[PDB]
A paper describes a structure:
Sterile alpha (SAM) and Toll/interleukin-1 receptor (TIR) motif containing 1 (SARM1) is an autoinhibitory NAD-consuming enzyme that is activated by the accumulation of nicotinamide mononucleotide (NMN) during axonal injury. SARM1 is a multidomain protein composed of an N-terminal 27-aa mitochondrial localization signal, an Armadillo repeat motif (ARM) domain, a SAM domain, and a C-terminal TIR domain. Truncation studies suggest that TIR is the catalytic NADase domain, while ARM serves an autoinhibitory function. Here, we generate a nanobody, Nb-C6, that specifically recognizes NMN-activated SARM1.
Further focused 3D classification around the ARM and TIR domains was performed on symmetry-expanded datasets, generating three major conformations, named Class 1, Class 2 and Class 3. The final resolution of Class 1 and Class 2 was 3.7 Å and 3.8 Å, respectively; while the local resolution was 3.6-4.2 Å for Class 1 or 3.6-4.5 Å for Class 2. The ARM-TIR domains in Class 2 rotated approximately 5° clockwise compared with those in Class 1 as revealed via the superposition of the SAM domains, but the ARM domains in both classes were almost identical, with a root mean square deviation (RMSD) value of 1.06 for all main-chain atoms of V61-E400, indicating that the ARM-TIR domains moved as a whole. The overall architecture of SARM1NMN exhibited a “blooming lotus” shape, in sharp contrast to the compact “doughnut” structure of SARM1NAD. The ARM-TIR domains, as a whole, swung out from the SAM domain and rotated ~139°, with 73 Å for the N-terminal residue E60, as compared to that in SARM1NAD. When complexed with NMN, both the intra- and interchain ARM-SAM associations were diminished, with Y380 flipping away from F476 in the intrachain SAM and only one salt bridge (R285-D489) remaining in the interchain interface. The diminished interactions release SAM from ARM and expose the site for Nb-C6 to bind. The binding interface between Nb-C6 and the SAM domain was largely overlapped with the intrachain ARM:SAM interface, accounting for the fact that Nb-C6 does not recognize inactive SARM1 as the binding site is obscured by ARM. Upon binding of Nb-C6 and NMN to SARM1, the ARM and TIR domains swung out as a whole with minimal changes in the interface between them. The movement and the accompanying bending of the ARM domain described above, however, did result in shifting away of the R216 residue in the intrachain ARM domain (black arrow) from E689 in the TIR domain, breaking the salt bridge between them.
Residue numbers in the entry:
A (entry chain B): 561 to 701
B (entry chain A): 58 to 549
C (entry chain C): 1 to 113
The structure:
Amino acid sequence: TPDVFISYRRNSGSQLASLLKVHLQLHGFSVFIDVEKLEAGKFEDKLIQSVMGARNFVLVLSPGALDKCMQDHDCKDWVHKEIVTALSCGKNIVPIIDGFEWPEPQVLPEDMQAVLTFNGIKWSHEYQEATIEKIIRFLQG
Amino acid sequence: GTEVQDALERALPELQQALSALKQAGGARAVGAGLAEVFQLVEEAWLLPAVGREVAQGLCDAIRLDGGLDLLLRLLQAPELETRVQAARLLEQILVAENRDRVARIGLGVILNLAKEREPVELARSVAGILEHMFKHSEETCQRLVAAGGLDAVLYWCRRTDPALLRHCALALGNCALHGGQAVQRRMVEKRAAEWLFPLAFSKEDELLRLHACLAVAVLATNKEVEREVERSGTLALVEPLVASLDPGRFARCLVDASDTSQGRGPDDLQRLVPLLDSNRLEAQCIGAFYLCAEAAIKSLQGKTKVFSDIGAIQSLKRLVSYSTNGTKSALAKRALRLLGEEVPRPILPSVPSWKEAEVQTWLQQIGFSKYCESFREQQVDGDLLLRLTEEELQTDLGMKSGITRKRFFRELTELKTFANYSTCDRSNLADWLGSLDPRFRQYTYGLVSCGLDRSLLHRVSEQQLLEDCGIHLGVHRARILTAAREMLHSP
Amino acid sequence: MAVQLVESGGGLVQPGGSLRLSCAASVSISRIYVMAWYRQAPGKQREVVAVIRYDGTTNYPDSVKGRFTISRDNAKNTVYLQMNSLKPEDTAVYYCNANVETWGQGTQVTVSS
Ligand SMILES: NC(=O)c1ccc[n+]([C@@H]2O[C@H](COP(=O)(O)O)[C@@H](O)[C@H]2O)c1
């Protein structure tokens, strides 16, 4: 059973997710990554399984392509669905930010996104093994 | 001959120029220029694709025997790093097997002490290339660089962002499972190398890095004792859609348009990749075949195809296309063969339905059931009667009393049935249609064509007819044939 | 495909002593499904001596198990049968066989002094 799940934007935020997965697997936490469920995963054959098996939902906030999730009220937005399912289940939501463009409260309405009520973690590039001990905290598996 | 000389006419007194400048030291102001003069154009000897590749390799004894590499390795202990970072490049650029043997003999330990510094990326790049070309020496040096801190450096550099450094690391990690035997491959998973190859394999920035990382992980998952640990890493799944999507023509165009990495693996140690084609793991076979057809498509545009002749690699490709159950591997092998200018071998199968009594006697002798030959001789059984032989007629008319004997006979019978030639009676080619779903279904292709069943007549069948007329006894096989047959209901 | 086979070797050997027989084909030996070596005693029926399939899986009768060895070579397409310890009862005409129908010509083998 995967302990945590990491979601990411397909274009940006791909290498950092792999570094997180390799360090977290070296820490032993059963982590599940998910790749390219745009039309295949639409049947929730893996989505609900991942968001039920994962106790701590993780987010990588790279410079983000939130354009599909912001100024888009549509309920067919794939990234918005896979984020609001974790928001609705209300498990441990810890994000990792990397100089991301901060969103405005006027956009991403309260019924769309409420993840702004949390404080993420800033990634380091010089020495990485310091922040990992701070990401092992705030898990509560 | 003539092209060979034009390379060393400039190369030789200019590599002497180099020697001169190496061992004539004006410290930092003059070693710098010398290194740039010998970096700009010595590496351009790999930019002459006509001759000048071989020339370098052979010409490395004029540098190594005089002691120039040894002289600079004795002078690379200078405390300043600026005149060392630009100097370590020509080390990896002038590393060939003969130059490798003496550095593996004497001078080991300055690289192990220079690998302690991992901050400068321009330095770490050259050290990664040094370890890449040093891995491939022999078993003892592999055991010494795994027993020392050699693996930790390239394992730490996997968290970087430099493209050239990550490519050199990917190429470095793959020269260890080749020259490591089995215990070093059992230590590499203990040193957690297969997990740190996930970022180098999952990289949508360069496809070259993905191919190098997937070949590096596939050459290591052939050991059965560590296979159960390599699948736990989460990387053994990435090699299949990688080799599925990527076309070797595209990868060739990405190798022929780049100014470097031409003639990648070469005729020297390519043979280490050959047993991976014959290995048990299918993904190692497909990645080896992919690399072979890619370098063949590269090398076919020139007249260098004859280096396939004296190494006998075309023979190994021709032996693996017939009697092979792998769509991707056989497809890539047939593509390589047809692109290199050779024909695909067709299997020679025994035409069982057009047999006489003598052939039945000989086959009974071959399978070890000779005791019953006379019985088969008395009843006048030939191939047509043999392929439609049932258990009750076997028990009563032919005298096989035991049930275990009849199970053994039907085992040999099915093995002969899947490997027969039905072209004498099968017109609509039902054997390949049955073999497409599973090879183990080909054994039924006689019963079907004996019961006047055709492709165009196959979708309007019932399971009862398959059971009693065509003699298919396993319910699983009947269900699979039914669901695969009625899906193409009215396609014509 | 009309495949022609040729056999070579044989003659007279001393009782106890080795010999090697060879069968050469006219096509690539890797295309053929099964190859085999048969023995015909004077005035009796044939017997099988050695079998080999396309993946190199061999089977011998219990009498010659441990004394005879069959192997195929792909450089020059030839199947070899090596006999190590010969007994006086191994005097016969030997054949090679491709698939089950293609026969060879056969060679005489005697063991005496
Ligand atoms: N395309 C090539 O093969 C190529 C390109 C640039 C440099 N080199 C140098 O050629 C040498 C080849 O030596 P080995 O193939 O014996 O490892 C190395 O020192 C390498 O750095 C090769």
